[PDB]
């Protein structure tokens, strides 16, 4: 039932049975890895690469074509982000709400939602420190959060 | 105590809303009288 809301939604991508598809496809393992390193250099997140691939170009999935996932390829090349994308987009959301909330102080609903996103940042950071995807002793501060994004 | 039943009024009774108020007036009085003897 999600997490924070009461909503209980079943919507998801359901991946196919066969692997290394498709028979119709060709190109190469090598040429796809060049395209990913090109678009990462353009400045584009691991989610946004695989959207750009399956939409315009071929490849349904990169894990089908190459052995590796997209973030595995970026981290091998050394064109990976500093912090992971889900933690990035939660912090950027929290900074956006703090601009709104210190303009409009009487908005109680915005004050409620800022607790929920910043609570999620703290617990999701505690994951990423355990897996060593973040430097040790890395912590969220609402003073220094805005410069940390961009 | 009483909790939820508090006002069940299953059988002829004083009425809870009134009862709570009556006890409040007794209690309020207890305060000033106890502070008077300080």
């Amino acid at each position: 039932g999600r997490m924070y809301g009461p909503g209980k939604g079943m919507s998801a991508s359901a991946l196919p049975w066969r692997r290394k598809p498709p028979t119709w496809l060709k190109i190469k393992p090598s040429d796809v890895e060049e395209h990913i390193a090109k678009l990462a250099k353009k400045g584009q997140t691991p989610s946004q690469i695989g959207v750009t691939l399956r939409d315009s170009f071929g490849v349904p999935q990169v894990k089908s074509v190459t052995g590796n996932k997209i973030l595995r390829i970026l981290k091998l090349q050394g064109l990976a982000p500093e912090l992971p994308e889900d933690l990035y987009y939660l912090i950027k959301k929290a900074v956006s709400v703090r601009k709104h909330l210190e303009r409009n102080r009487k908005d109680k609903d915005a004050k409620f939602r800022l607790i929920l996103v910043e609570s999620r940042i703290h617990r999701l950071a505690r994951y990423y420190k355990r897996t060593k995807q973040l430097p040790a002793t890395w912590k969220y501060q609402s003073a220094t959060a805005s410069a940390l994004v961009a | 105590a009483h909790g939820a039943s508090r006002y069940k009024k299953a059988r002829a009774k004083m009425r809870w809303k009134w009862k709570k108020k009556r006890t409040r007036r007794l209690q309020r009085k207890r305060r000033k009288m106890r502070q008077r003897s300080r």
Binding site: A14, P22, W24, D55 | -
Partner: protein
């Protein structure tokens, strides 16, 4: 009176994606032919972005809820 091992093609087509016996996607890919160019482009059925041509950008399809609309008379062949 029932057959969970061998379900019917008609009924399992109606069901949701994940509730089928083997889950697999009801989306697909398309070799699209825009009117001007002789070139062809491999385009996903549900496209979230406005897809441009192989040279001098026309426009293949605009994104919607589910399946993207294809721009005027232009043919498409499923893979």
């Amino acid at each position: 009176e029932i057959d969970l091992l061998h379900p019917d093609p008609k009924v399992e087509a109606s069901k949701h994606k994940l509730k089928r016996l083997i889950p697999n996607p009801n989306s697909f890919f398309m070799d699209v032919k825009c009117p001007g160019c002789l070139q062809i482009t491999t385009v996903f059925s549900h496209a979230q972005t406005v897809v441009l041509c192989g040279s001098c950008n026309i426009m293949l399809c605009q994104p919607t809820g589910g399946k993207c609309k294809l721009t005027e008379g232009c043919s498409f062949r499923k893979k």
